[model samples]
Target: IVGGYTCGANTVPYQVSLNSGYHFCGGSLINSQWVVSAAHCYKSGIQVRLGEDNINVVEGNEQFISASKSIVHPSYNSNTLNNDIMLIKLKSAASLNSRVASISLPTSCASAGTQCLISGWGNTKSSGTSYPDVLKCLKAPILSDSSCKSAYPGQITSNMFCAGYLEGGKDSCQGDSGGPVVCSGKLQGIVSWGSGCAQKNKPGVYTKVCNYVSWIKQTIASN
Candidate 1:
């Protein structure tokens, strides 16, 4: 099923583990060294598991990398999830092979209503729990600019992109924050917020990838 998309099967996805070994939703590999994710995924001693399906199945070909640096967007605020993105620089780059790969970043912004792809081990339904081993993906149409503004009222900033269904079902959930929302084979958004996981009339909000290009490029260049 993962083969249907342009993103390779080995393109790295992550599960953010907080204390008590509880795992959250997915993330993806950007450069050879950085894991682009949601800022809320940041926690002390958090470990990233790359190239694996199940968090419990640690015996596979997955590479466990300790985060050397966790840089959350300076403007990020957990309260409102503003600029809710982060990059985890690994101590070393992963060996690029069958089980490890990287996704391309978008060079420009996508227009409203563009269709995109999102994947994760997150909840299948709004009230459901996370998936254990198999990753799932879905097609989401970009919400119209007018609709996004209306949905969030005055709070919709240009740095945010909206997707997912307004009628319910088919959305990212609690653990899925920070994962990529890819379109045209490019990383264009990061899962940020939603009214609730897959809720009716509430679209999923994402950190607009294009708006942060300068910061992302500068950060990568300096590192």
Candidate 2:
């Protein structure tokens, strides 16, 4: 909302919306039937919308699938927000098309200062009442772990990273949780939590995807 705009359809085909009776969080399609998101976004009766651009209109490529299961990280700590990532399995496999694809996971997170993108249909402002129907994207740089640690002393763990402006202006807000945070076309992070939307010195916090690549692959195969 601070510095972002609507994104084009198929441009971010990996994007998915997790609907827990209503639009609640964002998720990423990692495969034909697997997704990755924040563990904290889980709820009963969850479903997924894939290959969707606009929330109101039902595009030809849009597909809705009931969730089969949600696998949260065993070490996920609700108190500290550590290992905040989760993997979701779709009831049926998605049929791949131009408007439906999976994102690649990175071997590691991007280095400090790397430009990354975070997208979702969330509130336009930190305290706004309106939530957009179309997907929105914001560009920001990844902060060094130390700098991020400084911002959130004793809160940020190795499994977590930070992005956005320290001065405040652009960030992911409420309902944007579990959204994709991509760098160089690779999935690097997931919108886990934040102090506030684009607040000064309070950049958006994310779950470091690279840290759990092994765990992700194993969970997907095991489950």
Candidate 3:
């Protein structure tokens, strides 16, 4: 995350790394066996790493497992990035502990100006490339729908919302897609897209998690 600080070990127990020999995307564990991420991050051979603080070092608390299934929202549209959320079912349920746990789903929609947590291992810059070794996070307030509509005219949809600074400084960048945007201890958003890492007038867009709670529950129940 750009303009963020290292998260305390286990500070984001629900955070998980989607890997393909290396960290690629971030996700939130919603249950013992399911991870929620952006649909754009989905791939066939992803490995889910839980309880990871730093990718460069071995952390005893880590739980590595393969993705048994990847269910992208049926309505997901790549062109508009609508319904960007996806669910990854673990091959085996994660053994919950202090360093590995599930985050509760959002019970209601968050309002504009609600401060929220955005965490991931994405690049620290918009230009120069390189993902951080340790997990990072920053607090950003949810922007009003009008603000989002003004920023990216014709792009904002009911299923997508934004959270960040209009001045530009902190944001979730590449490699952070599918990460958690926790509001009030609940999963509220999934990092979907942005113009650049923490760019002004272009806050990071996320999948509005509250709009899909029923879909999430039904997907898990039937599959």
Candidate 4:
């Protein structure tokens, strides 16, 4: 998160590092072998690191697996940034344990004003001079759709939602995209995009996970 600091590694076990030689995005382990993340952050043959605390160290409890296939939403708009979501089918299933496990998916969209937790491994500064060795987390409030529309004008869509402080000190900056945003103990959002890094009146926008649950199910089933 933009203004947040360190969160214990094991605090969110479903959190995974979506890597292409470097930590680029975050992901959630939805099942033993399926990972949900942002489409824009994805690349074929990426690796997922689970049960990881420090990005610099590979803990004994951690599991590393390469994704065999990636399914990006066909309608994903690179310009307007619509439907920015995707899933990764891991080469092998994750082994469930106290330090590693799957997080439940949201059954419905999160209501306006809902507060959620976002975690990832990225730069502490929004503009990215340096990144943290350990995972960082912060509490972000889900802003009303109206607020999001006002903030981005005609940019925000139903497939997307906004979160973060209105005054703008806190946000997910140069940090990993495709990270997990957990609320009410369920996965609700995927860290997608924002205006420059933690700017005021510009809260971070996420791909609404609940809106794409059916698509997620269908993709996994068809793949």
Identify the candidate with maximal lDDT: 3
**Residue-wise C-alpha lDDT for candidate 1, range 38-103, written one tens digit per residue:** 887777665666776555666476777777888888898888788878888877887666576677
The list of candidate 4 runs beyond 4 A from truth reads none
lDDT of 3 by residue, 128-218 (tens): 8877899999899999999998999999999999999999988889988999999998999999998988888999999999999999999
Using all chains and alpha carbons, the TM-scores for the candidates as numbered come to 0.87, 0.96, 0.98, 0.96
Candidate 2 lDDT, 31-63, residue by residue in tens: 998999999988767899998777767767789
Query: lDDT for every model?
Result: 0.71, 0.88, 0.93, 0.87
Backbone clashes in model 1, listed as residue pairs: 25-175, 38-178, 166-201
Q: Candidate 2 has what TM-score? A: 0.96
Ranking of all candidate structures by their lDDT, best first: 3, 2, 4, 1
Q: By the TM-score metric, which is better: model 1 or model 2?
A: 2
What lDDT, from 0 to 1, does candidate 3 have? 0.93
Q: Give the Cα error of residue 39 in candidate 1, in Å.
A: 1.2
User: Which candidate comes out best when scored by TM-score?
Assistant: 3
Task: Show pairs that collide, candidate 4.
Answer: 2-171
| Per-residue alpha-carbon lDDT of candidate 4 for residues 141-189, written as tens digits (9 for 90 to 100) | 8999999999999899999999888898788866568998899988999
Candidate 3 ranges beyond 4 A from true positions? none
